[PDB]
From a paper:
Myosin heads consist of a motor domain (MD), which has the catalytic and actin binding functions, and a lever arm that amplifies small structural changes within the MD to produce filament sliding. The lever arm consists of a small folded domain, dubbed the converter, a long α-helical peptide that binds the two light chains, an essential light chain, ELC, and a regulatory light chain, RLC. Insect flight muscle (IFM) possesses a highly ordered paracrystalline arrangement of myosin and actin filaments that provides detailed X-ray diffraction patterns and electron micrographs. Here we report on further investigations into the HST state of IFM using a 2 ms duration stretch (str-HST) or release (rls-HST) and their effect on both the structure and distribution of cross-bridges as they adjust to the mechanical perturbation.
In the step-release experiment (rls-HST), the fiber was released by 0.75% in 2.5 ms and the freezing impact occurred 6.5 ms later. Although a step release decreased the total number of weak attachments, it did not change the relative proportion of pre-stroke versus TM-bridges (71% : 29%). The range of structural variation in weak-binding attachments can be appreciated by superimposing the quasiatomic models onto a common origin. With the MDs superimposed onto that of the scallop transition state structure, the image can be interpreted as inherent flexibility of the myosin head. In contrast, more of the weak-binding bridges in rls-HST are pre-stroke bridges (gray) and therefore their lever arm angles appear anticlockwise with respect to the scallop structure. Weak-binding myosin heads within the target zone sweep out a smaller axial range, 27° (5 nm) for str-HST and 9° (2 nm) for rls-HST, than the strong-binding heads. The azimuthal mode for weak-binding bridges in iso- and rls-HST is 120° and represents attachments that did not need their lever arms azimuthally rotated away from the starting crystal structure in order to fit within the EM density. For a 6–9 nm release, the detachment rate also increases to 104 s−1, but the conversion from weak to strong binding is even faster, >105 s−1 (k45), indicating that most of the pre-stroke attachments would convert to strong binding ones. Releasing the muscle moves the target zone toward the end of the shortening cycle thereby “consuming” the available TM-bridges by presenting them with a favorably placed target zone to which they can bind strongly.
Residue numbers in the entry:
A (entry chain Z): 4 to 154
B (entry chain Y): 15 to 150
C (entry chain C): 5 to 16, 24 to 196, 216 to 402, 410 to 620, 643 to 729, 734 to 835
The structure:
């Protein structure tokens, strides 16, 4: 819709400006752009539409940008069910727990990995805390991440 | 307490204990410690004060220097603004990168002058300790 | 184990065997020949016959993989590497020529007729088979019986054995040994066979003791697992043998017993002269029977009536009514050139008849020559109603006889479950085939298809039910057709049935009305071909039955299906002196009996016995490979074994299945057994690669490995999606800062440049210096 495309516009600027204002954005940021308009595509997802592994590789106008966002819209988003399901498969106890160490492993080691920094990051952000045994309720965590930075 | 020092200072600097600072006053004490400035340095160093250097025109030029700056809290935050995880440290390559080619790009010298002091140990540059050092 | 009791029961094997040289090549005499390849040439393989050492070529795709000496005389064929018509025929024939006549074919048993008595049924042997698990002891029919018992007991459900095979195979002998077995682990039961066989068996070319009725006998069990009763059901007795018997065949056994002098005392009670070749109704075909002593069989039959608990009058009522028949056919006649109605040609024999049936000889011949509103009969209309009467009496005797023997067995004791045994009469093709045969054959079909259903159609269904994993397999084994050609709405029988109700009808409107409906509209129905056996009497059409092509002559099929006895004589006998005598079409009726039988069967855990006729000569220990092989084909043995080896080894309890495979269609999950019904449904999973189950799912082979594939995939994605979610959260979190960081950087950039320039201020330098 218009108020929508206007939103793409709004954000496109903040970005195209920061990597040198000139009406073009580094295809390596196309991810973060859309990540700002709510959506959270997967790296596999982004490259599919035009994203790049590195800066410099290439820049893009707003003309080519419209469809990348048309694209990253029709792509699957994870529900609470799904995040709850997957996390259960690591719980031997079955009581909604996990250890810090393991959670760390899941994030950094499995699936489209996550740097060790983004991890200590979101941990601190969501202010996730372990008990005496060093375990955490993965249910709470999933809920925050899902919540947003500003709830 | 910034004043208490200023005075006691002006005292040690004002050698001929005449309540005034003269080209000989400066030259005097400098040499008693480390290398001192050349006549030209001493000259324009005084010309920086309209009239005689009583403990007043002293505190005047010193205060007009340290004026036009912010807080130790205001700066410690402009820093934690890149410290997502809230660890109270910035990764050295990061900060260096920010200052170097972002915003109002620094220069190699600004870069060297700055890090010659900087408290970096373990890859992480502690912006707290450094905010203090640069401030109070 | 050194046990003498295993002489003809336990298998008594190395070198010269190249798994690439040695193979099975088609043969005309032996069905398959042991060959050793010599040279390939595209498709033309050149092998050497190990036997005669001759040579020949054979299409490459006609060679069959031979099994290694590792499986010589194997007890269970499902355990062989190769289960092909040549490996099977070889294994059997191997065992057979060594005394071993029992072999498992996977889940069911194979019995090859011995044509000789074997010391394998003794009480010594029965002791050893008791409570033994099929793999624990050599193959034997006792094992099949013993196991059905254990199942009924532990599983708490009815069991059942369908003993099938061709005519002269071993269906009856084996049915009896099963009962004799179950009885031994009672006296009257065993004793009901001698009387029923005397009245419902006869020499035939094929069988000297051919059963001419279908037999289903259920054996009830009580709360301590012991025999507590039993009943018998019979089907379609050959009413026709009574008055007629093709050459080389005899009438029922009794008639010959009755004229031997086993009990001279009875001669005057029946009014018979001890000469069978004296009575037309029983000397048409054969008289004597190699290996059947009518003298002793009569005695034992008499002896058996006693044990059954038959009052002396009762058992003399039987004997007389049947000897009476021996007279109905002695009543000669004549016409009287004019009108012909017909007149008698004496009365001596027609009285003995009225006498034995306790009715007036006068009132008889009367209601027989001018049935009453009156309506006289000609000279043949009579001789044929005579036969109509003989046949109809005998059909009542036999029926009453069974009701009575059940009287003696339906002990009102307490019943839990039972074990039935089905012995139905088998396939038979003669020189001339008519309605009688179509009936037997339609019967036998039928059954085969049951095995096909429960064996292939069935197996996979349960896999689905339980909700396991699997992919379908078409064994291509269906006769619904043949079945359909005969039984369905417009079928053969239905045509005949609607043709009887018309008095106008005849052997030609029936014959034409048939082609009219199925010629070219059903390929099982084919114009009569060409002779495959001398003396091959007339044929009007052919049917392609599971075990053979049968040329049927439909002449006389209209009267054969609509019975017809002077409703007059039925009045005479209705009020006869003898107490016994005093006491819907055939097609429809039988079709119904049969359907009811089948219905009763389906509610069972079937164990199958497969009989096999070794040759067409009735001689023992001799094999005719072609014939054998041929049976190992129309019976479905091989296939019957593939699934036992092939099958669906997976198995999952819906409770543990839902927990592990919900994550594969969660947008369809609002009960563990339905949830899975959904998941596997969502995935648009092939009904083949899996099966139902009450408490568990059955997935064909490999499938579960593949589900754990899809399972991971999803688990990886989801993990990525939550990492994506974490990537998007952190980005959006730092969005204010793109303004915030632009400021927070200008602070630091402008405020370091200050502290930088302040240190480059002489005053400050010198100041800092003084400091201490």
């Amino acid at each position: 819709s218009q108020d929508e495309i206007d939103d793409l516009k709004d954000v496109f600027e903040l970005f195209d400006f920061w990597d040198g204002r000139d009406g073009a954005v580094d295809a390596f940021k196309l991810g973060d752009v859309c990540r700002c308009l709510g959506i959270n595509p997967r790296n596999e997802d982004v490259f599919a539409v035009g994203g790049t592994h590195k800066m410099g590789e290439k820049s893009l106008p707003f003309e080519e940008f419209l469809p990348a966002y048309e694209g990253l819209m029709d792509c699957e988003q994870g529900t609470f069910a799904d995040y709850m399901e997957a996390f259960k498969t690591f719980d031997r106890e079955g009581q909604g727990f996990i250890s810090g160490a393991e959670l760390r492993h899941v994030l950094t080691a499995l699936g489209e990995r996550l740097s060790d920094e983004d991890v200590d990051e979101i941990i601190k952000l969501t202010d996730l805390q372990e008990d005496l045994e060093g375990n955490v309720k993965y249910e709470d965590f999933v809920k925050k991440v899902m919540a947003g930075p500003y709830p | 307490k910034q004043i208490q020092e200023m005075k006691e200072a002006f005292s040690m600097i004002d050698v001929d204990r005449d309540g005034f600072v003269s080209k000989e006053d400066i030259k005097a004490i400098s040499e008693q410690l480390g290398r001192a400035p050349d006549d030209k340095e001493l000259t324009a160093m005084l010309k920086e004060a309209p009239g005689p250097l009583n403990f007043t025109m002293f505190l005047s030029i010193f205060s007009d220097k340290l004026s036009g700056t912010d807080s130790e809290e205001t700066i410690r935050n402009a820093f934690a603004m890149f410290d997502e995880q809230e660890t109270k440290k910035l990764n050295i390559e990061y900060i260096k990168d920010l200052l170097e080619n972002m915003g109002d790009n620094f220069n190699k010298d600004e870069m060297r002058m700055t890090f010659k002091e900087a408290p970096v140990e373990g890859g992480k540059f502690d912006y707290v300790k450094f905010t203090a050092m640069i401030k109070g | 184990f050194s046990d003498p009791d295993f002489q003809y029961l336990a298998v008594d094997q190395t070198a010269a065997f190249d798994g690439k040289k040695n193979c099975w090549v088609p043969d005309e005499k032996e069905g398959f020949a042991s060959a050793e390849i010599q040279s390939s040439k595209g498709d033309e393989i050149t092998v050497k016959i190990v036997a005669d050492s001759s040579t020949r070529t054979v299409k490459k795709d006609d060679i069959q993989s031979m099994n290694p000496p590792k499986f010589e005389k194997l007890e269970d064929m499902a355990n062989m590497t190769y289960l092909n018509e040549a490996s099977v025929l070889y294994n059997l024939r191997s065992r057979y020529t060594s005394g071993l006549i029992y072999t498992y074919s996977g889940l069911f048993c194979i019995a090859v007729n011995p044509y000789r008595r074997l010391p394998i049924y003794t009480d010594s042997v029965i002791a050893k088979y008791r409570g033994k698990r099929k793999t624990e002891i050599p193959p034997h029919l006792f094992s099949v019986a013993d196991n059905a018992y254990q199942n009924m007991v532990t599983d708490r459900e009815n069991q059942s054995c369908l003993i099938t095979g061709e005519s002269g195979a071993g269906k009856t002998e084996n049915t009896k040994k099963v009962i004799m077995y179950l009885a031994k682990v009672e006296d009257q039961i065993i004793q009901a066979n001698p009387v029923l066989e005397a009245y419902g068996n006869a020499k035939t070319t094929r069988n000297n003791n051919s059963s001419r009725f279908g037999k289903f006998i259920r054996i009830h069990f009580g709360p301590t697992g012991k025999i507590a009763g039993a009943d018998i059901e019979t089907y379609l007795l050959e009413k026709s043998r009574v008055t007629y018997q093709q050459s080389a065949e005899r009438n029922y056994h009794i008639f010959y017993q009755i004229c031997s002098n086993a009990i001279p005392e009875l001669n005057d009670v029946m009014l018979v002269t001890p000469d069978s070749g004296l009575y037309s109704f029983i000397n048409q075909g054969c008289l004597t029977v190699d290996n059947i002593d009518d003298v002793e069989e009569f005695k034992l039959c008499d002896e058996a009536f006693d044990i059954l608990g038959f009052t002396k009058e009762e058992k003399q009522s039987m004997f007389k009514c049947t000897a009476s028949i021996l007279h109905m056919g002695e009543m000669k006649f004549k016409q009287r050139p004019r009108e012909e109605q017909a007149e008698s040609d004496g009365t001596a024999e027609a009285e003995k008849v009225a006498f034995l049936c306790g009715i007036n000889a006068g009132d008889l011949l009367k209601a027989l020559l001018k049935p009453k509103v009156t309506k006289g009969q000609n000279m043949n209309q009579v001789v044929n109603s005579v036969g109509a009467l003989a046949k109809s009496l005998y059909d009542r005797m036999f029926n009453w006889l069974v009701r009575r023997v059940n009287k003696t067995l339906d002990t009102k004791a307490k019943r839990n479950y039972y074990i039935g045994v089905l012995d139905i009469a088998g396939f038979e093709i003669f020189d001339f085939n008519s309605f009688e045969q179509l009936c037997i054959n339609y019967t036998n079909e039928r059954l085969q298809q049951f095995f096909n259903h429960h064996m292939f159609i069935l197996e996979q269904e349960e896999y689905k039910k339980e909700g396991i994993a699997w992919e379908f397999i078409d064994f291509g084994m269906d006769l619904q057709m043949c079945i359909d050609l005969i039984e369905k709405p417009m079928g053969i029988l239905s045509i005949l049935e609607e043709e009887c109700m018309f008095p106008k009808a005849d052997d030609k409107s029936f014959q034409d009305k048939l082609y009219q409906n199925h010629m070219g509209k059903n390929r099982m129905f084919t114009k009569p071909g060409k002779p495959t056996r001398p003396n091959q009497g007339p044929a009007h059409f052919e049917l392609h039955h599971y075990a053979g092509n049968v040329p049927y002559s439909i002449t006389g099929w209209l009267e054969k299906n609509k019975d017809p006895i002077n409703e007059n004589v039925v009045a005479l006998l209705g009020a006869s002196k003898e107490p016994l005598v005093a006491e819907q079409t055939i097609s429809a009726v039988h079709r119904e009996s049969l359907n009811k039988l089948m219905k009763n069967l389906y509610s069972t855990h079937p164990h199958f016995v497969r009989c096999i006729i070794p040759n067409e000569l009735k001689q023992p220990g001799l094999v005719d490979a072609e014939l054998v092989l041929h049976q190992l084909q129309c019976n479905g043995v091989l296939e019957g074994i593939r699934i036992c080896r092939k099958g669906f080894p997976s198995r999952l309890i819906y409770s543990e299945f839902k927990q592990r495979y919900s994550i594969l269609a969660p947008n369809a999950i609002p009960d563990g057994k339905t949830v899975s019904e959904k998941i596997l449904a969502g995935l648009q999973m092939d009904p083949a690669e899996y099966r139902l189950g009450t408490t568990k799912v059955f997935f064909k082979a490999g499938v579960l490995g593949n589900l754990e594939e899809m399972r991971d995939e999803r688990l990886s994605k989801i993990i990525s999606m939550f990492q994506a979610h974490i990537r998007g959260y952190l980005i959006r979190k730092a969005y204010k800062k793109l303004q915030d960081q632009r400021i927070g950087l200008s602070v630091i950039q402008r405020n370091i440049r200050k502290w930088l320039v302040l240190r480059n201020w002489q005053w400050w330098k010198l100041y800092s210096k003084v400091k201490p």
